[PDB]
Amino acid sequence: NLYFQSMETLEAIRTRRSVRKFSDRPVEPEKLRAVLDAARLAPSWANMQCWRFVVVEDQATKVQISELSYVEAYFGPKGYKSNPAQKALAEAPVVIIACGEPPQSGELRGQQYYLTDVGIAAQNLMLAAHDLGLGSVFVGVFDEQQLGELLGIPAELRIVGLFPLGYPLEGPKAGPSRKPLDEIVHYGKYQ
Amino acid sequence: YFQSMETLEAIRTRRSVRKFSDRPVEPEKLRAVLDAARLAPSWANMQCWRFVVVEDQATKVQISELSYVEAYFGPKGYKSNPAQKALAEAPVVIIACGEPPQSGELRGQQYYLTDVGIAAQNLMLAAHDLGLGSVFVGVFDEQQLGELLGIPAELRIVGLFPLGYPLEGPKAGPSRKPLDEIVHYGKYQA
Ligand SMILES: Cc1cc2nc3c(=O)[nH]c(=O)nc-3n(C[C@H](O)[C@H](O)[C@H](O)COP(=O)(O)O)c2cc1C
Ligand SMILES: Cc1cc2nc3c(=O)[nH]c(=O)nc-3n(C[C@H](O)[C@H](O)[C@H](O)COP(=O)(O)O)c2cc1C
Numbered sequence A: 001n002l003y004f005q006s007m008e009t010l011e012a013i014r015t016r017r018s019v020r021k022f023s024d025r026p027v028e029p030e031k032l033r034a035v036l037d038a039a040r041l042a043p044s045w046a047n048m049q050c051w052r053f054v055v056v057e058d059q060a061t062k063v064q065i066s067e068l069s070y071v072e073a074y075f076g077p078k079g080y081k082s083n084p085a086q087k088a089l090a091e092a093p094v095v096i097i098a099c100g101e102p103p104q105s106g107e108l109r110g111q112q113y114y115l116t117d118v119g120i121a122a123q124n125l126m127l128a129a130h131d132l133g134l135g136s137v138f139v140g141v142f143d144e145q146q147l148g149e150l151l152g153i154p155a156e157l158r159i160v161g162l163f164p165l166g167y168p169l170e171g172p173k174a175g176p177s178r179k180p181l182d183e184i185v186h187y188g189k190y191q
Numbered sequence B: 001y002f003q004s005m006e007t008l009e010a011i012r013t014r015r016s017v018r019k020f021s022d023r024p025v026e027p028e029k030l031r032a033v034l035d036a037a038r039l040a041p042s043w044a045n046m047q048c049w050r051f052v053v054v055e056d057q058a059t060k061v062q063i064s065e066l067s068y069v070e071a072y073f074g075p076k077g078y079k080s081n082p083a084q085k086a087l088a089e090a091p092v093v094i095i096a097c098g099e100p101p102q103s104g105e106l107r108g109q110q111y112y113l114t115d116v117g118i119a120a121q122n123l124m125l126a127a128h129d130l131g132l133g134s135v136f137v138g139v140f141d142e143q144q145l146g147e148l149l150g151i152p153a154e155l156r157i158v159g160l161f162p163l164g165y166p167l168e169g170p171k172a173g174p175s176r177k178p179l180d181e182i183v184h185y186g187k188y189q190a
Helices: A009-015 A029-040 A059-067 A086-091 A114-131 A144-151 B007-013 B027-038 B057-065 B084-089 B112-129 B142-149
Strands: A051-056 A094-100 A158-166 A185-187 B049-054 B092-098 B156-164 B183-185
Touching: A009 A114, A009 B007, A009 B027, A009 B112, A029 A051, A029 A094, A029 A114, A029 B007, A051 A059, A051 A114, A059 A086, A059 A094, A059 A144, A086 A158, A094 A114, A114 A158, A114 B007, A114 B112, A144 A158, B007 B112, B027 B049, B027 B092, B027 B112, B049 B057, B049 B112, B057 B084, B057 B092, B057 B142, B084 B156, B092 B112, B112 B156, B142 B156
Parallel strands: A051 B183, A185 B049
Antiparallel strands: A051 A094, A094 A158, B049 B092, B092 B156
């Protein structure tokens, strides 16, 4: 169809969900290019565009990636005792590996803005995917050392997120909650 | 009231806006911009971001004055801060903060920065969609800004966002690298 699932911007922002169950239906090359181009058009620190995307479609490689995305029992990061998106990395027809080059973005106040820049691009990627009737999910749980070795990624590049990309197998699950605007927004100075 | 846009078109045409009129921002539009940010995905849905909304003129002027680039050892890519005046000019400044321990801290990476980036992009896309302009400002004296606004030191300030109606018609943005420069297909050989 290419255009049937098109949405108004605010509607796409509202209805976008993390998708973790994918059909094996292939992703049209046109849609993949559009999703990646959306990432390309993100703003970045001084327009340095420090993001780099490795796009994997090979089945054997995707299984190997999925096997590097388990949580180490009891040594998991905050909030993931397991990785609900682990199977998605094998099952989705495409996996986009989003990387950043740290010295190619702001490094001040002990903050490394390549992480911010990749976040911005990732959100363009995920909104564009959703706009085109695809699903995706940001995967932050992965063994970076082993994944870098598997993929042969240049040493200077830091891996930030993995993105399964494909057609959702099922309809929109009523996702997790959000905090009320009153909890996350404060008006004026604070005393 | 806004000229609605298809998602991909908003993504493509959103620009950093640094020149603003004094036209008031409808409270409904401000709410919608903040709601867009609220709806962003985050590490384990932790929603570590916090936003401070400043409208007071004197306070915005003071924020602007803390957003200079230092003479030497200034941040990479900014020999000056083209958005500095926008902070005083815009009707609204949104200060985006995050809590480092409320997001991923692993591999020496602090995902609060990623989470705030994701939310900021929702904010900027929604603003543009609604006929407003914004720009992500990363240059600021954090200690002084936190003191000015009463942000507890345990919250880190990540970005400042002037928000208002663009003074001028849409401008051409700077370049982007061609897609082949930022995308590689398949694993690497050797
Ligand atoms: C993390 C981050 C920090 C930024 N900091 C500043 C800043 O301090 N001053 C400024 O004028 N622009 C800033 N920008 C805006 C970029 O310069 C702008 O996004 C880039 O040149 C691309 O232009 P566009 O947004 O019009 O596409 C920042 C953007 C990002 C993503
Ligand atoms: C930086 C980041 C890392 C994430 N990592 C994972 C992950 O490793 N595994 C997973 O299943 N989901 C992951 N997610 C998805 C979040 O769990 C999800 O965005 C959140 O629960 C909100 O749900 P929604 O995206 O459907 O609105 C991640 C999201 C972000 C922003």
